[PDB]
Design a protein around this ligand. Structure first.
Ligand SMILES: O=C(c1ccc2c(c1)OCO2)N1CCCCCC1
Lengths: 412, 412
């Protein structure tokens, strides 16, 4: 029968910090992680800025010899996973290693590595493709390499659901534990799509903000002057654990994961429906899963991408699901500060939702100078809002009309 | 408790055929789908052959205009998915669309699209990258496009576990139905990695057979002269359905999906442990999941990739799990004929496992001319073997030591 699932460890790389606490301090201070990209010449690109991880030292985690064969998305996913496992205080033994698994996903995986091996193929030939190219680039190898480093022999998989990846990864890892397939899962996502193909590919869809002359103001969810999402890099990992397992070992419990929803829009390859119908179905699934009155929801970490159609669809979905209570909860987009970490967005935002519960504060939506038509909820404009939060919801939406919602609550 | 899951529809593209019955006819006749790769200068490559899909007409499924937006691996996944849904007779309605979902995956995704967009980027700059580059290349677009075309609003996701993808996709879709999150799922995988990057990538790791003079003899699982896997393309999709739902509409039921196992080796990146300890745990997990004793297994569709280390690990795992029954079961690698479809391998091999149950026949392991040291099981060398089959296992093992097993049983 279905077991309860709690969060006992968290790990992060984001454009605001090389761990959770440093990232969270930036979130609560309303700091932007967005800046002109230094790692490549983007003069031919319509977008030349994003959320870079700054000063990442992979030799805090792995040998340079190993790190050199891994795409950055694997490096970031391992760093976040190592932090989460250490934060959990969990000891991996012969007695429990078969009951600990990992589900770390990515939207795009090792695009930098694929682009560099494509350059080798086209400028030289197949003889110059790295032997390490495939296992160093493909999405399942955060789960793979983490399991080899820590000796995790439980369920070992990866989701790829575009911008919903991190939320689905955490939800489905919780279902694994709920249903008895595991007692512990490391779950979340990682992304590093800031290469020529990533910036040029989102650029070709005209999906990205082009505010090159003011990058910190580019990401402006629900603002009338928003012009698309800001591409960001990083990772979030959470240790999910069966409640009685966590209680038995005296674990510090951050929060309980009480609800998970998935729904497909079945609307459009890339555009969300304006009325937010799929997001509304997804949130209702999640609230019914959690056995909640919708009025119990105090805080929503929105998807909040800073796209014209996405941001307004979310307002419509929240009004539809919550009715008059839509005016009492607080909803914010931390993408205002981090930008859009794509497959890692739902992982870092799940962490921000748990910390909103720990610290009783709604992170701000920075840059919300002029809320657009109908964006008249409490969107925590400009400054963090201390408040009562018993229940926090984290939403993600992605290409393919793929939706996820996570419901977290305080554990006493 | 848990609901029962049955297979009511199947669909396939493989090196043997453009549908299930044509593919299965090749399988039972011992025919190879392997040939020199055409319309591609492989002069500089150490492998010049593989399993191509021959004569695929995407316009049976999509308009030319919608097909131009999608990588071949998405086209192949949609073809298998449309076939499977047609084969099931399912009628999607407003009353059931929220109960019908998709989990179609891929191991490597849109390499061909990436390669073609790399050409444009390097030669002409980012302004020649296609606007549909991202949504036409990412792995979750089979689930995305399928849900949009058929109006499916149930769970919408995509797994990517390298060579285990199709097995895990089907298993976790089966969990969705068993635990009441959906009544119907379309599940499986698709792959088209026959580009420079895929042949070059696996070639650089020396993972591929280089038997260019005799491509049809290259894939020779458990043969002492095997020299690596054969890269192949295609797709498999199954309609998974809750039993009472299938019975109420008078569905034709092929077989029951009774067990699903997952494990991690937590051992090696590529070469599994010689004793197949991980594959043994995974198979035991699948049988415990089905409430079956190892003695009840009749037929195993091996992973059987034709790699020195892989093939021998599976012999050890089977001897370990099955003890004095290990010789009584029949175990064959249909990769001897199809080659290795990577993320679609588990999907097409679940279909061959189902059809072994329907037709009471173990497919051959062709090219098994000289069984290697210790390869003394009933590996169905050379010719199909009619026999009693009540219970059929299908195994997949992938990069990162990620394992999957499905258990299928006759239904009547
Ligand atoms: O250092 C490596 C390694 C080897 C080859 C690789 C790679 C990493 O990434 C892509 O190609 N390993 C392999 C097993 C994982 C634990 C450390 C040892």
């Amino acid at each position: 029968s279905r077991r309860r699932v709690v969060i006992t460890g968290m790990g992060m790389l984001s454009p605001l910090g090389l761990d959770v606490p440093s990232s969270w301090e930036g979130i609560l201070a309303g700091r932007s992680g967005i800046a002109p990209i230094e790692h490549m010449d983007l003069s031919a690109y319509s977008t030349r800025f994003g959320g870079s991880v700054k000063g990442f030292n992979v030799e805090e985690y792995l040998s340079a010899k190993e790190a050199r064969k891994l795409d950055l998305f694997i490096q970031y996913g391992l760093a976040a996973s190592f932090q989460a496992v250490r934060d959990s205080g969990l000891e991996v033994t012969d007695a429990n290693r078969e009951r600990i698994g990992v589900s770390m996903g990515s939207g795009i995986g090792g695009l930098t590595n694929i682009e560099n091996n494509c350059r080798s193929l086209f400028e030289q030939g197949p003889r110059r493709i790295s032997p390490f190219f495939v296992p160093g680039s493909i999405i399942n190898m955060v789960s793979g390499f983490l399991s080899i480093h820590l000796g995790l022999q439980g369920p070992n998989y990866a989701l790829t659901t575009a911008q919903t990846t991190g939320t689905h990864s955490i939800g489905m890892a919780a279902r694994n534990i709920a249903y008895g397939e595991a007692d512990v899962m490391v779950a979340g996502g990682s992304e590093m799509a800031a290469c020529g193909l990533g910036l040029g590919g989102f650029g070709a869809a005209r999906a990205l903000s082009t505010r090159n002359d003011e990058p910190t103001r580019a990401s402006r969810p629900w603002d009338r002057d928003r012009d698309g999402f800001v591409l960001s890099d990083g990772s979030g990992a959470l240790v999910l654990e069966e409640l009685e397992h966590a209680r038995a070992r005296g674990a510090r419990i951050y929060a309980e994961l009480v609800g998970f929803g998935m729904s497909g829009d079945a609307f459009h390859m890339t555009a969300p429906p304006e009325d937010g119908a799929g997001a509304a179905r997804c949130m209702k699934n999640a609230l019914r899963d959690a056995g909640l009155d919708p009025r119990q929801v105090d805080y929503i970490n929105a998807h909040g991408t800073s796209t014209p159609a996405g941001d307004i669809a979310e307002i419509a979905a929240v009004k539809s699901v919550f009715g008059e209570h839509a005016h009492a909860l607080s909803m914010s987009s931390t993408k205002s500060m981090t930008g859009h970490l794509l497959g890692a967005a739902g992982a870092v935002e799940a962490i921000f939702s748990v910390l909103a519960l720990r610290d009783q504060v709604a992170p701000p939506t920075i840059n919300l100078d002029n809320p657009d038509e109908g964006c008249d909820l409490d969107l925590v404009a400009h400054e963090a809002k201390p408040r009562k939060i018993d229940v926090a919801l984290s939403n993600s939406f992605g290409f393919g009309g793929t939706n996820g919602t996570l419901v977290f609550r305080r554990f006493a």
